[PDB]
Design a protein around this nucleic acid. Sequence first.
DNA 1: TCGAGAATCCCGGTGCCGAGGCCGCTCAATTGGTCGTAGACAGCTCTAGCACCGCTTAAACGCACGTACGCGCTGTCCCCCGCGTTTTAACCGCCAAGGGGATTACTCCCTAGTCTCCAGGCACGTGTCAGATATATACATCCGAT
DNA 2: ATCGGATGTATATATCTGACACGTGCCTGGAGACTAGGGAGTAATCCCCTTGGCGGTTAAAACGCGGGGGACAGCGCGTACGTGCGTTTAAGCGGTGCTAGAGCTGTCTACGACCAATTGAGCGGCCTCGGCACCGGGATTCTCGA
Lengths: 107, 107, 87, 86, 455, 93, 93, 98, 95
Amino acid sequence: AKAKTRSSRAGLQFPVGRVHRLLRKGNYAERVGAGAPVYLAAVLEYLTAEILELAGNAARDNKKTRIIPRHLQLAVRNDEELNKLLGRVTIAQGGVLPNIQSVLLPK
Amino acid sequence: AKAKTRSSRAGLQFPVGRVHRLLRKGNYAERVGAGAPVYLAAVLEYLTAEILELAGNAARDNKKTRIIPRHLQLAVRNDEELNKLLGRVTIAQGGVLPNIQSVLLPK
Amino acid sequence: AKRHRKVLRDNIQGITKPAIRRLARRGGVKRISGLIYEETRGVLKVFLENVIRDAVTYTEHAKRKTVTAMDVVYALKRQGRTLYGFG
Amino acid sequence: RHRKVLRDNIQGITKPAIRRLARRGGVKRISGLIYEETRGVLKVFLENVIRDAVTYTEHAKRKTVTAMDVVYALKRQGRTLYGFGG
Amino acid sequence: EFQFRESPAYVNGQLRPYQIQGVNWLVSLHKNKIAGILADEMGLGKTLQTISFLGYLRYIEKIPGPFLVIAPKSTLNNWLREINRWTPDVNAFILQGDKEERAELIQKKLLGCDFDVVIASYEIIIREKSPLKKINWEYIIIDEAHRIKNEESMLSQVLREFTSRNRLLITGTPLQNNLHELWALLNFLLPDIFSDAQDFDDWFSSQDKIVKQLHTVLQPFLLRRIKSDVETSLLPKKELNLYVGMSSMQKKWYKKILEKDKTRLLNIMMQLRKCCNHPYLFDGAEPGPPYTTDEHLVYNAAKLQVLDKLLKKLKEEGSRVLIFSQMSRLLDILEDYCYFRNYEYCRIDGSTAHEDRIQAIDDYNAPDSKKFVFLLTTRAGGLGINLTSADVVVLYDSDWNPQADLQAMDRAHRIGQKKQVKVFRLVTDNSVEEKILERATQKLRLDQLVIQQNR
Amino acid sequence: TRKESYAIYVYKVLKQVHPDTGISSKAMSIMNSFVNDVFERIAGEASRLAHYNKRSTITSREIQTAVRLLLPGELAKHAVSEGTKAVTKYTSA
Amino acid sequence: TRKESYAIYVYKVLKQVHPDTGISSKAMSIMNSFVNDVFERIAGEASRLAHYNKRSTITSREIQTAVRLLLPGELAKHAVSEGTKAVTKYTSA
Amino acid sequence: KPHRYRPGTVALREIRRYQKSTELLIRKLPFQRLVREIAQDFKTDLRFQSSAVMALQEASEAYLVALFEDTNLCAIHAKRVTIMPKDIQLARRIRGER
Amino acid sequence: RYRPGTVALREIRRYQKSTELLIRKLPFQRLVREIAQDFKTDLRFQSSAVMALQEASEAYLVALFEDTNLCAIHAKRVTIMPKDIQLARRIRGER
DNA sequence: TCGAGAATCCCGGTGCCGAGGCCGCTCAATTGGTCGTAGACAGCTCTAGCACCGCTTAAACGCACGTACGCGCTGTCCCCCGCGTTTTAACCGCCAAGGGGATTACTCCCTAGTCTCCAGGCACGTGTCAGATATATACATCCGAT
DNA sequence: ATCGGATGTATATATCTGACACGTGCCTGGAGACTAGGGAGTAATCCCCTTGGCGGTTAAAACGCGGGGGACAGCGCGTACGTGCGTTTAAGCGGTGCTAGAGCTGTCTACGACCAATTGAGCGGCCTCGGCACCGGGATTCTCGA
Ligand SMILES: Nc1ncnc2c1ncn2[C@@H]1O[C@H](COP(=O)(O)OP(=O)(O)OP(=O)(O)O)[C@@H](O)[C@H]1O
Ligand SMILES: [Mg+2]
């Protein structure tokens, strides 16, 4: 019979088979269920789509057509849920958010 | 032949066999070497002896002959290495170190 | 009417001002402003909400209906503040 | 073969560089004693990170320190770094 | 041996013959170096018999000695006022008050040995146990001795540390729940003789193989006289079960509780009982604020609705009512109700202070007694006290233990009642109350149909 | 030798979201390390959940609980919805 | 059922260190948690070392490197000395 | 005239006596009520082990004591001796939890 | 001439808009080698390893300066000071 | 300044309770063989890290000046502390109920292991277009004379 | 308060260019089909631990009051730092050679997993006594008004 990828069966873009192999070759448990790779792949795809949407909006705001680490940093730091998720993370060539304390501004 | 514990063979007080089993059933790696349990048991015994000696001294300083959580807390927090190791650890019923800032003291 | 005597008007108010003063004294504080108590109550509520949410998640996964000390310990460890003396 | 310290390399972190880092941090005015303190802080941070990275390198039985060793060391200290592998 | 043919000479007043027989029983028990459970029915003068036995021990065997009397907090004054009345020559005090006054009393009288009888409560015995343990007690007497039915209770453990020459247990309801309670009471009297939990349980294992064995086993250690074969003048109680429906408010709330409808509801039965008693016991049911007591109370609670009519009718006939409850807040609701109906109540509960309890009892029992109803809780005010003035007992809600209600009703069916006592148990139809009534009936049968019947 | 990455899958997701936007190599490397990091966090939490409950199998229940534990607020709800939808679609086919 | 712990071993070490002091139940519980925590930290670091180096076996040198990574300063030297001495004594017999 | 201590002597006495002891400083029953009310918003009709509530109380008190030490440091840095809500806020901001 | 503080604000805006590295590369590389020679003699470094170290160091220093600025403003000042840095590190728990 | 005075510390005595010691299971650690594969060792290759040299020019360094900020001092006022009184809510023990958790036995179905394709992902050229660079321009803004 | 003039920044335009997106060939890892077995779900049991309300005791909390000392605003004064200029030096770029080291490959072989029998070590249960917690009473110390 013809072969159909588990990703296509689940309607995903991320690879279910690769995730299954990484789960069962990473010393996580003795056995891995059939639905665990599908669930994990769906979650990873969702998070990737979220970050990429925000970064694409940021890149459009600068009239650029390629996403760069600065755009990724802007997206992550301006979105509060993602900023909590990636609080202890450094993004190389990301920079900082523009923020000057109000007491330093001229009177 | 006559059974001899691996703790006895290594001159230890902690259970080499139990540590070996806990390594095997912990999903740490597919295979566990022969000297790994011996090394780990020796290290654990050393750390236990260090803490217990400091806590026994702290108990003696209060004219008591039984170690309590307060003595464990004093021992841990009064030396830098154990304080850095147990930096994010709360010891229940342990209290705090006596410490008053100097500017609060009367003139 | 003795039926309607009173309620404590919240449970967060049961963390009384003297208890907060005792905690501050153990922390080494000498004078305390009058606005410190509401702030402390809010901080304690946030901390408890986080820990209890994680503990209840553990309890539901275990399919139990009673929160256990082990669940609390795991939640604290997950939030990064390990607790010794309960399991 | 040959290796030595030349010109007391901690002073290569010049005053203008520290001022630029402070400006990126949002700092408007800088005391003249900040520079020595900053150099001490940076040296301590680098010492911890490099100690861990060299531990990884010599466990791997190598002589070259790799970006992946640095990344593992940072993850150990609790400062994940994206963009260099892993 | 000394069979004490007539009424005690030293005792003021004349005691009925069965009391003399009971005193003789106690004397015989004492001589044979054994201890028993004086377990006459609730209402016969067990306290008088105990006081007369103590008077015998002090005047015929010449042993004034130290005597300990442990009783519920509501009966300490009754014990004092009867010792001072039947044998008005015994030095007796009550070890009650603040821990400062208790310390003063200890230092003055207890450690100075300037006393004969020490009256104390179950709470002060566990609390002032170190000074009390320093006395070689001749007799340790426990009124309402079904409080030590659990051998693991701290009171029982504390009592098993005193030094006592002999012991006495008084209770009108010896058998409470199962047979292990009886063993717990007996192990206190005769620790050496019984000493055995499993042996007692399996010698008996709950036709004629065991019940007659029960009667022979407890024959030397237990004496019971029933109020029907002895008094034959007190009229027997006429108890009735008033089945009531539910109010629309009660129906709605009962449905909400059963259908799991933010408040925490972890004990379904207790919430259902609260609903069946009065819906206002739930926070938010009462319309308000502003909160008014005008009339809404009486009609949205079926029990209170029946109670209002019955209370009105009784006031017209000229009777006086005793109302018992399992809940103290429901007693507050009843307080507010008698406020609006302009009645004169005399509430006592577990939080009522000592002198307040004394004053309430005397006010309700005073001649011409202008108080109409007594509000009591079955636990605090349901033991030992002597409210013989009233004639109607209303059991607002039943208990899981039938004996806790028998005690309550017999606070009016006692010596010197000379009236007809009517008991009105209020039961709510198609609720959990019927379940608790059924379970209480089974527990009652367990003992009443079997052991205490032949006594 | 070959090295395995998430680059093509991330590019597919990007073309789904913004059909006309590119991505540079440094940003792609950052996204790759982000995916690896999140994978490791979720899988480690699921592993120790199974260890706590004395189970020797990692299932979608463990994955869902780990997602709830790790992700904050709205992210957790939407991720749980996505995973449940995928598992249902997979099982039905 | 049966709950295993490190209590007897901790007591043996205590009798070696201070022959005449005792220990309370709460203190023993704290010591047990400490031992379990340190075991978990070292084992986890050794496990991920083995994963990084594409090995499949946890060996005594993996344990040594994990100890060097975790313990601070002068603790690491003495712990490594103890571990090496024990392994030598064991292999000799 | 009666005997009154100066406005800052009893405070030092309490500091010493509370840093010397180890008991819990919050009442158990109010804390239990607070915990149950908070938990009721995540799952309805939960039961609690006594050891679970005890662990929660121990962790909470340790957390608050550490926060008060940090607050005291901030207040002293500002050249005061009274702690203030701004001091609490700064301490939580630097710690990375706000 | 610009008044004191105008150019400082211009620099703040410039450097919070840019993303490049603010320390020169050769001095930082020499510093890394010198520190590393106290752990193992005759080490070699990948260029990407040195770049990772610089990235991490600069991020750490910028975050520290943000916290120091907050502490200085709390003390009712606009100049950062060594006591401000020490307080920030003590609160973060690096002391 | 030195004499009350309230708090803390020893200190001997008592009790009480929790730590320590002893006695039967039972299960898990040890011993002895048997395999098979993960890793150690030797060899080779190519690549990338190091060392050197030369040029340029942009950044760092040292100096001077002047301003605005940090700091010290003063005064005020208000707010927090220390103390006393009363009561009310916590604490502990009691007493029921019953829900929920932990155990046991059974079975089935779900996952691992094996082998065989085959197609999807990776590495490798290859064009080409988004973006960085240089130049000119317009604008918003700051800072000093009316 | 308001104009004039420098000044730095953002904008538009044209130009490379090198990094990205695209197309091609391979191989390796994933999918299909089949088998076997053991992990987990299910049902029944029981007993234990939680819940809720009460009863009594009592110590902490809440409220009010009097006052002193700490926070905050205002002012004045050095002084330390920012701004700008001129000079030099060292970083960045590039190009080169080289050689040390990291990674790939093939070959054993010693070591770790597995398995079965067995015994002794650890746990749970049951006991006592010594350490520690009150408790009163005296001594010492420190504080606050002189
Ligand atoms: N011989 C007597 N003469 C007159 N009155 C008596 C006599 N004996 C008992 N009483 C009455 O009995 C009342 C005392 O109650 P009693 O001692 O019977 O309580 P009890 O029935 O022993 O206790 P409980 O009812 O709790 O079991 C007194 O009011 C007293 O008047
Ligand atoms: Mg009586």
